[PDB]
UniProtKB/Swiss-Prot annotation, chain A:
Provenance organism: Saccharomyces cerevisiae (strain ATCC 204508 / S288c) (Baker's yeast)
Residue numbers bearing the N6,N6-dimethyllysine modification: 5
Protein's cellular compartments: Nucleus; Chromosome
Residues of the full protein shown: 34 to 128 of 131
Positions bearing the Glycyl lysine isopeptide (Lys-Gly) (interchain with G-Cter in ubiquitin) cross-link: 91
Role description: Core component of nucleosome. Nucleosomes wrap and compact DNA into chromatin, limiting DNA accessibility to the cellular machineries which require DNA as a template. Histones thereby play a central role in transcription regulation, DNA repair, DNA replication and chromosomal stability. DNA accessibility is regulated via a complex set of post-translational modifications of histones, also called histone code, and nucleosome remodeling.
Family membership: Belongs to the histone H2B family.
Name of the protein this chain belongs to: Histone H2B.1
Entry keywords, A to Z: Acetylation, Chromosome, DNA-binding, Isopeptide bond, Methylation, Nucleosome core, Nucleus, Phosphoprotein, Ubl conjugation
One GO CC annotation: nucleosome
Protein's gene: HTB1
Curated annotation (Swiss-Prot), chain B:
Cited function: Core component of nucleosome which plays a central role in DNA double strand break (DSB) repair. Nucleosomes wrap and compact DNA into chromatin, limiting DNA accessibility to the cellular machineries which require DNA as a template. Histones thereby play a central role in transcription regulation, DNA repair, DNA replication and chromosomal stability. DNA accessibility is regulated via a complex set of post-translational modifications of histones, also called histone code, and nucleosome remodeling.
Protein name: Histone H2A.1
Naturally occurring in which organism (per UniProt): Saccharomyces cerevisiae (strain ATCC 204508 / S288c) (Baker's yeast)
Complete-protein stretch covered: 17 to 113 of 132
Protein keywords: Acetylation, Chromosome, DNA damage, DNA repair, DNA-binding, Isopeptide bond, Methylation, Nucleosome core, Nucleus, Phosphoprotein, Ubl conjugation
Claim: Cytoplasm is one of the keywords in the record: no
GO biological process, one term: negative regulation of transcription by RNA polymerase II
PTM per Swiss-Prot/TrEMBL: Phosphorylated to form H2AS128ph (gamma-H2A) in response to DNA double-strand breaks (DSBs) generated by exogenous genotoxic agents and by stalled replication forks. Phosphorylation is dependent on the DNA damage checkpoint kinases MEC1/ATR and TEL1/ATM, spreads on either side of a detected DSB site and may mark the surrounding chromatin for recruitment of proteins required for DNA damage signaling and repair. N-acetylated by NAT4.
DNA sequence: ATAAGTCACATGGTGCCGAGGCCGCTCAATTGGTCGTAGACAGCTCTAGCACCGCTTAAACGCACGTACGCGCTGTCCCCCGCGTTTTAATATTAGTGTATTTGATTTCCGAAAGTTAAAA
DNA sequence: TTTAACTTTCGGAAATCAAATACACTAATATTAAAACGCGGGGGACAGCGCGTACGTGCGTTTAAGCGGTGCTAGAGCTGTCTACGACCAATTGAGCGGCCTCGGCACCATGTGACTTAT
């Protein structure tokens, strides 16, 4: 048997449709970008909860994630990342 | 209505939520944390694939390939710091001039 | 002439065949609601900071200057390889067997939870 | 006086047992892309050298670095107290694809009455 495997490939392809509607993706490229988000997710979350443990505070929260991303990303990308995280969570909380 | 739709995000905020639960990083998770993380991941993915698409334009073909991806990631000097440890599958290596 | 009768006509209705039109069951994850507890907080006090002077003379910077030192120099040695050649072993095809994984049904395993109390500066 | 280890339990985990694929390798095969032998070569990298040089090598007078008092206050760390916020439960949905049905339309046999007719 073979269990259903987690993937973000549909979302990756959709955002590529938004960017370049005429462009497709190779299978190897799609596996590569599917691995991108999981690798980033891990190296953000571990650092964020380690920072939370340094705070000796129970909850991993938005401030912890913001700090973790701005720690680990190179600064030029970090500015964009924190701005987009903040505006996204604000748009959500405005619901 | 879905959480991703309410956020305006394309990526699966609910999947990021449940994955944070699976990754046992902390017992109590703020509700804003998964959506913030999903937004960050979506931004990074969009940026890298846009760079790869422009690389494909430079190579004059309409499908992304690991060579396009490797060229983009190595050429962008900030994402090369972010993924300096990574080497891409069928990605190659950049020229001396 | 007319009650009986045959007859055809006319309409009844009963039966079977699709078929397009609603319907039934299930699982996603939402959101509705609700306990209980992390979180920010409420007076707070005192820490190690960080000035804020107020000395001293130990570094230190320049003043001199000097071998050391460099840096191309230069006969020449040498070695790498650009091929040209025979090899030469890298293809990349089938293959079934021989576990390798593997996914059901448990079936014990065991530590988080709930008392109860040992210990502990 | 506060950080543990007794315990007293139990209900998900982590064993087990099993068969269902299925994949690895151990292996024939002619080909055939690259290996590796084989001699010059350029080319270059090192020998040897002059003299310019550049960082130490060496003195004089500075400068900061280091103490050494003199505050004083900004946070450290701690709030004693009020929630909020999120972890749970479940309901509160839903949509998608099978199921019945049920529409109406055909082919077929039943039933009554209008001719008419005849033997009443």
């Amino acid at each position: 048997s073979k269990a259903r495997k987690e993937t973000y490939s549909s979302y990756i392809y959709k955002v590529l449709k938004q960017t370049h509607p005429d462009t497709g993706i190779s299978q190897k490229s799609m596996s590569i970008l599917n691995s991108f988000v999981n690798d980033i997710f891990e190296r953000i979350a571990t650092e964020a909860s380690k920072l939370a443990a340094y705070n000796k505070k129970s909850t991993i929260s938005a401030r912890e994630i913001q700090t973790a991303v701005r720690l680990i990303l190179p600064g030029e990308l970090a500015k964009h990342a924190v701005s987009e995280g903040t505006r996204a969570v604000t748009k959500y909380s405005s619901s | 209505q879905s959480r991703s739709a309410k956020a305006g995000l394309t990526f699966p905020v609910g999947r990021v939520h449940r994955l944070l639960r699976r990754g046992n990083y902390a017992q109590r998770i703020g509700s804003g944390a998964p959506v913030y993380l999903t937004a960050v991941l979506e931004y990074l993915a969009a940026e890298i694939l846009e760079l790869a698409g422009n690389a494909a334009r430079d190579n004059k073909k309409t499908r992304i390939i690991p060579r396009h991806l490797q060229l983009a990631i190595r050429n962008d000097d900030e994402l090369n710091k972010l993924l300096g440890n990574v080497t891409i599958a069928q990605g190659g290596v950049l020229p001396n001039i």
